[PDB]
Amino acid sequence: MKIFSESHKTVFVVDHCPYMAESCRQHVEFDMLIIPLAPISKSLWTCSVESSMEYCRIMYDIFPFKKLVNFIVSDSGAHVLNSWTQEDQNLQELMAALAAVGPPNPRADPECCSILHGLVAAVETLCKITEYQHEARTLLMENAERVGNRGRIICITNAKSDSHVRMLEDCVQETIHEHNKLAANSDHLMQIQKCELVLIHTYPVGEDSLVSDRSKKELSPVLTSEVHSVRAGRHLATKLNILVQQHFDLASTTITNIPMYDVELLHHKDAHVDFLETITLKWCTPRTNNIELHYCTGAYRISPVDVNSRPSSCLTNFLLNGRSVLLEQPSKVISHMLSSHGGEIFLHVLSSSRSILEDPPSISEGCGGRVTDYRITDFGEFMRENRLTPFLDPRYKIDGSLEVPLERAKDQLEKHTRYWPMIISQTTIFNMQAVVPLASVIVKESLTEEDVLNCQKTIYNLVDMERKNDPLPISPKRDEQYRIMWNELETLVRAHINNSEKHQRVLECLMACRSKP
Amino acid sequence: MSAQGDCEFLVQRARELVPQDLWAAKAWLITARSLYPADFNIQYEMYTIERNAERTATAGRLLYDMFVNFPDQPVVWREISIITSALRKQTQFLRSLFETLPGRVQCEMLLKVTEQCFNTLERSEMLLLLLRRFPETVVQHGVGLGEALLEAETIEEQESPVNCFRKLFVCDVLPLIINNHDVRLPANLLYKYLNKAAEFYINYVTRIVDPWERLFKILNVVGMRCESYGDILHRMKDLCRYMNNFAHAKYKNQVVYSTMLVFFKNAFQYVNSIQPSLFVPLVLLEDVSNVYGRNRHIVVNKAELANSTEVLESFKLARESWELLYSLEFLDKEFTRICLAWKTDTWLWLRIFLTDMIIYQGQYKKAIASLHHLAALQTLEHQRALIQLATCHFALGEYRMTCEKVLDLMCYMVLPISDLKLLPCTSKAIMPYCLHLMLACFKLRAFTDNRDDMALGHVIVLLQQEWPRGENLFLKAVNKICQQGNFQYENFFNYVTNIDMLEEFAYLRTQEGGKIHLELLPKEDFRLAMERQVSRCGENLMVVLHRFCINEKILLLQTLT
Amino acid sequence: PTVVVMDVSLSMTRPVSIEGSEEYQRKHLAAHGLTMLFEHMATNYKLEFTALVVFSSLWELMVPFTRDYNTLQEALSNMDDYDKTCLESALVGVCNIVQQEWGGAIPCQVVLVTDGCLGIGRGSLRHSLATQNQRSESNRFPLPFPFPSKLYIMCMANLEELQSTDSLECLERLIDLNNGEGQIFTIDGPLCLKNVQSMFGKLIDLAYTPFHAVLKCGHLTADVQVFPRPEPFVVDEEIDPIPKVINTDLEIVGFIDIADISSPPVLSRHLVLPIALNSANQIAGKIPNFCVLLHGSLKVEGMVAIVQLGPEWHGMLYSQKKKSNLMMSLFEPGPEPLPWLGKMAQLGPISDAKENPYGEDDNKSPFPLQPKNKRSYAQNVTVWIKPSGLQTDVQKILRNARKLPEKTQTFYKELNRLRKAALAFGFLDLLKGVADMLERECTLLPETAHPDAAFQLTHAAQQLKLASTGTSEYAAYDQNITPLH
Ligand SMILES: [Mg+2]
């Protein structure tokens, strides 16, 4: 839908009771190369944190903006780890905050807390306004109602029994009801329109699933709870991977035949509306400069599902170094292209079907097609002198009004074409090297004193050639050629008098020094 | 000298002076009367002079004196006859002079006139006028006058009960006799009174101010003497519940007479609402509406009859009354006796109501017999019996007599446009009814797992009416064609002017409906006729369906199943 | 593209009660209307691909997508009259041909030359509309075309009277499952040729009128035509729901080297062609046009020409077998459609820069703009979900321990990464295990007995097993481990 959908606001609630401190019974074997040590294992807190942060990493890679997350560990209190500003939505801040929270207390107070505090703080968090929501509300003056506050809460906890799940769902429904009632009166707290819930229950491998799965169940016209049960370790990570794929409408790609194994990527599902559960695009041999402007119907950010691994790291390093990669679908047709546009790897979806703009009318038949003296190199110089560059800092024009650089570009483009003949045979002042300083300076807005001196030198040199009657380009008596060239020079200069006063000075000099009987 | 000559001379002298001096003539007449008080000529001359002078009192006194003294003079009889004729400016003066005479004198003069009367009708009229003027004499004259009128009517051998003497007796003599409390009459005579009054009332209304109100009042008076039209029926039903369970002549006489009276009133209202001439016609039918798929309801639109509720209520009331009349033995016997005493021809309206009631009842063989009787006695307007026989035959699964009745129904029906219905006798409603009947007959003929194909063709052709309601019926027919694969109907292209039907039949002939072998002609020829037949889509569907009905009248051979 | 789906059932072979003139079948009226449409689309819309699909009991493709409107004109009078009406199969065939020729994003206007008879059963329109709409299953109703379509229904059945006596809600619903992208056209009044021509003129005005524009580069102007006509775009349905069309005047604002723009995602690619506002090759073919100069210079220098199609909407103009022509592509409407160029309203002239960003000899370029936050493939993240990642981390830890004290900086960087990840995950048991591995590696030192190697390894092991306890000595996240001098 729009920007303000359920995926625009996602809150993570991770349990932090001493229940999430026992090992997950999935001993790791980091000891490979006498008698090895006892294998290490990760707590349920560690597994939930790892999987949640992988979810966050994938979302941040594919959606750098307009998709935010809130991280709420649920302990004795409810410690919110980051805010809704698009500056605390950073992985490094989240790792710092989780390190501050630390491992769950094993022997402080086992049954003094629960998870419901995290959920109450999460629903109290869904009411706040993201900076994008505030901007939309302040833009929709007197109509700031078509901006939803839909969200989503993900809860990873070691539920004791199914009744615990049901009372958690009752608690969250009650919290949304009460907080909606509270936010109806107030103004700086939005009313939640849809708060989907996920209540992933994690248990060690080998223990019975004391809580069974349950499909989506609408507890309200504002809630839709769904319960998952999955073993801690790799299964929980896979569950949250499926969750991130289905929350943001992601898709998978399995790029193969990479010259040195497969590499899996995660992008938006819109990149696979052309082909139509992972596509298997095959790497194609890159050419140096075969073509440079491909017709891409969409560019989507990607994120490796195995980023640290050697094949995906090799592919991403190759892409980041500067070159691109063309991918083919299963004679062969090129359907995609991976390009890194300045440290951001993109997946372009090229078009391989018939072009409706095929066999277009020849430019040699249309209007002006039978003309062979076009100032094509002159216009090339015009194009290359009127290029575009980005400006970071804002500049002030006079007072209280900063200049939009696009407006400056358009003003310059209009300025440089006040007098600009099209065919070579039309113009004569633009066909000799003497007037190059005059042409390249007069079009400017503010002339330096050296520029004025150069214009004076050019005018005096033109007078000298007139005195010597050096033949002019063909582009029609010897004196008539110089008379018409002076007339064209006056036409050029007379059109730029409004730029400044030095243009007026050079115009007066030109009028005085021209050979006008 | 005889006194007659002197009296004549005095009369001549008085008469001669009348044009000159009325006072002198009056004085001469007075002197002559004083001289000869027994001279009737002088009294007659004085009476004539007083009448010519427009003097009411003097003329009345002279006339009374002449009548008292000289009743044998034919001039007195002529004057009495003239006065009676005037009573039955000069007429007003004569009527005023009549009031001058005493009531006893007027009664005596009326009695003398009645005695001297010769014609039966004139004597009856004079007696009725005298009774109206002097009710005191009706005690010993009212019954005799009515008896004499009835005897004269019987002797005159009047074919119809509409008789002048009977009409006078019912209108005037009967109410006068009934209202006379001093006059005592037996209940057996009240029976004859009410019989003749009812006969007169129904004969007048079937064929005046209010025959129905007069008959109802007479019935109420007769019922009270022996002691709305709807409440009395239920009251009499309660009386039956108090009497029918166990000579008791009063109760049986009531249960016959009052019930038959309300029955006849409701029946007249019914047959005046439907077929108003017999008092566009309305025919009670059984129009099967779901072709494409005791206390019953008559479905009738309020547009064709703006007062349907009251008419239906009257029909229900009359049906219940007639059912009660034939329910128990004594009332049934007495009702049959009185009805067969009257005209057994049953007229037309009563027969129509009886046929409608039988068709309502549920028995249709007796209904068909009654309709044969009605037709013998007798879509246009008159051809109601045809429609009624059509529905009656269709009721008892006949499915063939219905078909000939329908086919003959529309022979006199030319116009370019189950549930007990009630439709007019116009094409707009009748023609769909006939086509529904024929479609039902052929639908039950064709969908019987047999090898018949003309039946299926007749279903298809008659399915054009009221589209797209026959959508599922035609789809089932096409499925049957696909199963069989050998449809044969040479008449198919002469009547099926439906683009949906045509383009479904051309579907069957290429690949995907199966190459069904369609014998619709009596390779290129089949499509060549189809190109022509699609040009006929637009012609009046009713007209082509009627042409199919009349020209292809050989539907019957298939319909015999 | 344009798919002309035309009925050929028996319902369309019905003579029309037209006064005065001879009887025309409705197929003839359809043929005349399509004839005039093809005349207009071959005189003023010559660059459009049109395909004629005839449907009855089964769909058929008479002529494939072609610009040879004489071929389509020939086909109009070369048709048969297969009977029965089936529309769902026709729409299935339309989807098949559209997706098999153009793909899944090229718009396709579908001109359904229907009749209004709908059908009777089986695959009829009422049956398939009532059943398959709520039935789904394998055989889905192909009405919401899988491409930006616009279904026009040219129901040539009198006024909407003949449509309202039997059924018009069915057709108006048929348009509705296309998300309202369509228009019902009904022959006003009688079925005289003038009225069917009026209906097809309404269609021509609604769908096949060329998009004339003006191309400007300051004062250098050109009266151009953009094919196809750009389709309106909506940003979203909550903030900016109204559709925004491009500006009639394409304003070139600047030029970006075709290597600096790289390959930009675009909404749709368009063809800019000059128009005149053997005559066309002698009067208008000799006056110099701006599109020809622009195309030549763009092809030679190898550049694009950024175009302002509206407020906060920007485009691009470039060059282009061998046949090249001026081309134009619409970027997505927004402040920053191309993140490697920054906000398009922050692009300005190079004359306002301090130096020349492109370089004195054109060996540099300001583009591409690096994003603020490096993505996970640019930083050094620590993923330990799969055991292989953790094993690789510890093996890299131990391998650099043998190379100590030669590779001490990389070793300490790797160990600091490991400790930071362990603390942020609460994986202290990994820390104590790694300390024990450091001790084991110290025990296996070579006989050369490098002096600094033992000291640094022992100090790192001490710090590791002191941080593994969790006390506030070195368990702080930012307390990076420092070696021994
Ligand atoms: Mg059709």
Side-chain angles (χ1 to χ4, degrees), chain C residues 247-265:
Chain C
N247 233 304
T248 168
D249 55 291
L250 319 172
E251 186 84 39
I252 296 162
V253 307
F255 309 82
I256 293 171
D257 226 305
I258 192 171
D260 291 355
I261 191 105
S262 85
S263 321

Side-chain angles (χ1 to χ4, degrees), chain A residues 30-32, chain C residues 384 388-400 414 418 430 433-434 437-438:
Chain A
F30 83 112
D31 269 15
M32 297 143 305
Chain C
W384 291 343
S388 311
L390 173 53
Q391 295 183 317
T392 302
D393 289 7
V394 198
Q395 215 69 0
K396 178 63 169 299
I397 288 304
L398 311 163
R399 165 179 309 125
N400 277 232
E414 282 302 300
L418 161 65
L430 177 60
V434 159
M437 312 331 314
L438 301 203

Side-chain angles (χ1 to χ4, degrees), chain B residues 172 175:
Chain B
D172 320 286

Side-chain angles (χ1 to χ4, degrees), chain B residues 503, chain C residues 7 9 11-12 84-85 115 117-118:
Chain B
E503 88 179 359
Chain C
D7 186 347
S9 53
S11 33
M12 287 262 287
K84 179 94 177 324
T85 284
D115 171 57
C117 191
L118 286 201

Side-chain angles (χ1 to χ4, degrees), chain A residues 185-186 190-206 208-215 217-230 232-237:
Chain A
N185 154 280
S186 49
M190 260 209 183
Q191 257 210 52
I192 310 119
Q193 300 180 0
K194 193 208 308 200
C195 178
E196 188 157 336
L197 196 89
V198 181
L199 213 173
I200 313 154
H201 157 88
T202 183
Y203 52 75
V205 284
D208 182 24
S209 35
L210 311 163
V211 168
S212 297
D213 316 338
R214 144 161 170 171
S215 161
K217 174 82 201 103
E218 297 80 347
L219 291 63
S220 280
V222 84
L223 217 169
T224 311
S225 168
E226 102 169 293
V227 188
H228 294 116
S229 178
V230 48
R234 281 271 314 124
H235 326 74
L236 171 54

Side-chain angles (χ1 to χ4, degrees), chain C residues 12-79 82 84-113 115-121 123-130 132-133 136 141-168 170-237 239-255:
Chain C
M12 287 262 287
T13 65
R14 299 180 275 168
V16 152
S17 51
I18 166 163
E19 193 48 62
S21 312
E22 72 268 6
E23 306 323 294
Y24 312 133
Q25 283 173 31
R26 310 201 187 209
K27 194 149 78 171
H28 299 143
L29 293 203
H32 260 208
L34 285 188
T35 275
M36 141 185 156
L37 171 68
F38 287 161
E39 302 283 58
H40 162 95
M41 259 188 50
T43 309
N44 325 294
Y45 221 68
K46 351 194 183 187
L47 249 69
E48 167 95 337
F49 290 88
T50 317
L52 185 57
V53 172
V54 294
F55 77 87
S56 167
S57 319
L58 24 70
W59 82 276
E60 178 205 355
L61 182 100
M62 295 217 69
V63 292
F65 276 119
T66 172
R67 303 204 208 131
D68 220 351
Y69 296 104
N70 294 359
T71 311
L72 288 121
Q73 262 289 0
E74 185 182 302
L76 276 183
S77 67
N78 303 4
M79 301 215 278
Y82 335 112
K84 179 94 177 324
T85 284
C86 318
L87 191 39
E88 193 221 324
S89 37
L91 298 198
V92 166
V94 154
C95 304
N96 288 4
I97 70 139
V98 163
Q99 297 161 28
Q100 91 169 6
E101 204 79 76
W102 306 122
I106 283 91
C108 278
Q109 315 176 277
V110 180
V111 179
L112 194 32
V113 186
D115 171 57
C117 191
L118 286 201
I120 199 178
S124 152
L125 193 50
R126 296 207 195 75
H127 184 279
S128 185
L129 210 50
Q132 212 43 246
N133 201 10
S136 80
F141 198 33
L143 198 31
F145 293 120
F147 44 88
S149 53
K150 264 266 271 167
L151 164 76
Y152 312 119
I153 314 202
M154 327 287 316
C155 46
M156 38 211 52
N158 204 51
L159 189 58
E160 46 168 18
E161 317 283 355
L162 211 167
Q163 255 58 76
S164 47
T165 79
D166 313 357
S167 276
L168 172 69
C170 260
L171 296 183
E172 302 193 297
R173 166 182 331 160
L174 210 74
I175 280 197
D176 267 338
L177 291 83
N178 209 13
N179 285 74
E181 319 270 24
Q183 180 145 349
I184 278 276
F185 290 100
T186 326
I187 300 195
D188 209 320
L191 284 108
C192 41
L193 215 81
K194 188 174 61 181
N195 273 288
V196 71
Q197 271 161 17
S198 153
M199 186 197 31
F200 274 90
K202 285 140 157 299
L203 167 65
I204 281 163
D205 282 66
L206 184 82
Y208 303 109
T209 177
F211 183 94
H212 290 312
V214 166
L215 186 69
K216 295 185 254 271
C217 174
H219 283 295
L220 288 164
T221 173
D223 227 329
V224 313
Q225 143 196 22
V226 187
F227 181 84
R229 186 174 9 99
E231 274 241 6
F233 183 105
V234 313
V235 178
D236 64 342
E237 287 306 329
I239 305 158
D240 252 344
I242 87 162
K244 32 191 67 171
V245 83
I246 74 158
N247 233 304
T248 168
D249 55 291
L250 319 172
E251 186 84 39
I252 296 162
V253 307
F255 309 82

